[PDB]
Paper text:
G3BP1/2 are paralogous proteins that promote stress granule formation in response to cellular stresses, including viral infection. G3BP1/2 are paralogous proteins that share a domain architecture consisting of an N-terminal NTF2-like (NTF2L) domain that underlies protein homodimerization, two intrinsically disordered regions in the center of the protein (IDR1 and IDR2), and a C-terminal RNA-binding domain composed of a folded RNA recognition motif in tandem with an arginine-glycine-rich IDR3. The NTF2L domain harbors the binding site for several types of proteins, including host proteins that regulate SG assembly (e.g., caprin 157 and USP1058) and viral proteins (e.g., non-structural protein 3 [nsP3] of alphaviruses). Most of these interactions occur in a mutually exclusive manner via a common binding pocket in G3BP1/2 NTF2L.
The nucleocapsid (N) protein of severe acute respiratory syndrome coronavirus 2 (SARS-CoV-2) inhibits stress granule assembly and interacts with G3BP1/2 via an ITFG motif, including residue F17, in the N protein. Two SARS-CoV-2 variants of concern, Alpha and all extant Omicron variants, have acquired mutations within the first 25 aas of the N protein, raising the possibility that these mutations might alter the G3BP1-N interaction. Interestingly, P13L appeared sporadically among early variants in 2020 (lineages 20A, 20B, 20C, and 20D by Nextstrain), disappeared in Alpha, Gamma, and Delta variants, and then re-appeared in the Omicron variant and its sublineages. N-P13L, although in close proximity to the interacting interface, was not essential for the interaction. N-P13L slightly altered the orientation of the peptide in proximity to the NTF2L interacting site, raising the possibility of alterations in binding between NTF2L and N-P13L, a prediction we pursue below. Interestingly, N-P13L and N-P13A showed slightly decreased interaction with G3BP1. We confirmed this observation using surface plasmon resonance (SPR), which revealed a lower binding affinity of N1–25-P13L peptide (KD = 2.6 μM) with purified GST-NTF2L protein in vitro compared with N1–25-WT (KD = 1.14 μM) and N1–25-D3L (KD = 1.10 μM) peptides. Notably, we found that the Omicron variant mutation P13L reduced the G3BP1-N interaction. This suggests that targeting sites adjacent to F17 in the N protein may alter G3BP1 binding and contribute to reduced virulence observed in Omicron variants. In contrast, the aas surrounding F17 on the N protein were in close contact with the opposing side of the NTF2L binding pocket, which has as its central components G3BP1 F124 and G3BP1 aas 1–11.
Numbering used by the authors:
A (entry chain K): 12 to 20
B (entry chain A): 5 to 42, 51 to 135
C (entry chain F): 3 to 42, 46 to 68, 70, 72 to 118, 120 to 138
Write the structure that this text describes.
Amino acid sequence: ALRITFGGP
Amino acid sequence: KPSPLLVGREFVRQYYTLLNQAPDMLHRFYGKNSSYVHPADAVYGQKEIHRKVMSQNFTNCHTKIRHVDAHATLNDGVVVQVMGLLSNNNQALRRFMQTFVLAPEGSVANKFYVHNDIFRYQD
Amino acid sequence: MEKPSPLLVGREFVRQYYTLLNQAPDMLHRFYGKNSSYVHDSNGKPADAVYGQKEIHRKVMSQFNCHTKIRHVDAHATLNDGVVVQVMGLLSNNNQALRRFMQTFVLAPEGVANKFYVHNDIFRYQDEVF
């Protein structure tokens, strides 16, 4: 939940 | 919000590890309006950005990060400059800078997408 | 009415910026606002960056008859009708050795049309880094 993550909307 | 420099570190860490382990998975990071520039013109969107990435034939791509600036920018985004050395497919380490605007994905907390991606070797 | 190319925005700004860094470094601060962020080694390698107009002025006067050679300017649309500009080339302060550098502006609308301010000035000399 508090992990910074990356992906497109 | 989480420290910009933290988003900066983690994205950076995450990005060119993809460039070495799976370029074919790099597209996932990009929106529909996302530009990617490697002058050479911008491809846009996940589908073309993938096509361009696979075209660069990133092979055994080791990467040396010599600095990272990362600052809060408009829309609770983060701009990022990386200064570094990049070899590819066994070429000599070449110096370069890469500018990123990372932007909040909206739906999901602490999640960003790359809105801008600009890379230029200095040589 | 027609919108100005991002790349025009960027080029024009870089023209205007590296100019004023000769005409009146004193007067530079106006480019930046309240949430702005500026930098240009100190100790520990790459120095940290100030923020906000007042703090930026101090840091600018803490260095410039400057002469800039811009070898690369790229510029693109970003969030909130802003422009991210990637600058790259050479600087020499008070008639010294030309220095290689790698910079990144994020410009934003002022909200006067065609008027923009600097939300981020990330400047780095290369020698101090490589």
